[PDB]
Amino acid sequence: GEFADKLNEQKIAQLEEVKQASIKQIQDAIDMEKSQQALVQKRHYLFDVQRNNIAMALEVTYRERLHRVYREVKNRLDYHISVQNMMRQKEQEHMINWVEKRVVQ
Amino acid sequence: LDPVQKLFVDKIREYRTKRQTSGGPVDAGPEYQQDLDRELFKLKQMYGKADMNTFPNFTFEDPKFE
Amino acid sequence: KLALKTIDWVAFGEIIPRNQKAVANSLKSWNETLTSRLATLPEKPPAIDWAYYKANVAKAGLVDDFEKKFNALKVPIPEDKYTAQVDAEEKEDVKSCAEFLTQSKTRIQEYEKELEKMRN
Missing domain, CATH: 1.20.5 (Single alpha-helices involved in coiled-coils or other helix-helix interfaces)
Known part of the structure; x- marks a missing residue:
């Protein structure tokens, strides 16, 4: 009678480890595949971030250069005006003093 | 305040003699140049140490990465 | 106009070893920085009202000299080294x-x- 029970419980136990292995292995075929899919697309992005960064940094630089030329020229131009303006004021200032000193005479 | 009016006249005349004068700024006084130069110097401070009569040089910075 | 290889950030997060997360972080922020930057830094600068300056000068063809010199001065684009x-x-x-x-x-x-x- 027991002949069966031990054997049977043995036989089940087996297919119980069999189903188990089987899940565990196919879960692993699964992981492997995710690992791959990732290394695929995935990895390039790192270098893409890097290349993008460069591209931008040159653009900013180009633009900044342009802005610098502007600022500096305009700056040279504005100097002449500021000067001119200062001269006038000083000349003017002087004239009023010349006037009062003379009219209050 | 009708008498008061004939003073406008007196101002103009003196404006006139000044304006009629061509030989620098009228009644120099060495100070003028001094002050001038002083303010001419502040503007150098403001606008930079270059020859403002000249078009600018440019050597550009290399880009920078962080 | 720029080309800029499109980028999904959560993937980028998922490909960096831990001992390298530092780098990756700095790489991200630079990008963001850089991006913000270009949003505010215009292609070209404002023009220059040459007429106006010509209108208020004192040294002769300085302005003419400059407008000329300004235009047809070709600013170098930085080598991508x-x-x-x-x-x-x-x-x-x-x-x-x-x-x-x-x-x-x-x-x-x-x-x-x-x-x-x-x-x-």
Whole structure:
């Protein structure tokens, strides 16, 4: 009678480890595949971030250069005006003093 | 305040003699140049140490990465 | 106009070893920084009201001299002497790409072969 029970419980136990292995292995075929899919697309992005960064940094630089030329020229131009303006004021200032000193005479 | 009016006249005349004068700024006084130069110097401070009569040089910075 | 290889950030998060997270972080922020920057830094600067300056000058054809000189002065675009990444990439494909993928495939095969048996 027991002949069966031990054997049977043995036989089940087996297919119980069999189903188990089987899940565990196919879960692993699964992981492997995710690992791959990732290394695929995935990895390039790192270098893409890097290349993008460069591209931008040159653009900013180009633009900044342009802005610098502007600022500096305009700056040279504005100097002449500021000067001119200062001269006038000083000349003017002087004239009023010349006037009062003379009219209050 | 009708008498008061004939003073406008007196101002103009003196404006006139000044304006009629061509030989620098009228009644120099060495100070003028001094002050001038002083303010001419502040503007150098403001606008930079270059020859403002000249078009600018440019050597550009290399880009920078962080 | 720029080309800019599009980028999904959560993937980028998911490909950096931990001992390298530092780098990756700085790489992200620079990008963001850089981006913000270009949003505010205009292609070209404002023009220059040359007429106006010409209108208020004192030294003769200074303005004419400058307007000329300004235009047809060609500002150099910076050399891209920086794409050694292309290289560091191709390298990590020797590495990541082939080597790993080749072994992963072979492992998936045996696993499959191992499920083969078990079917019988």
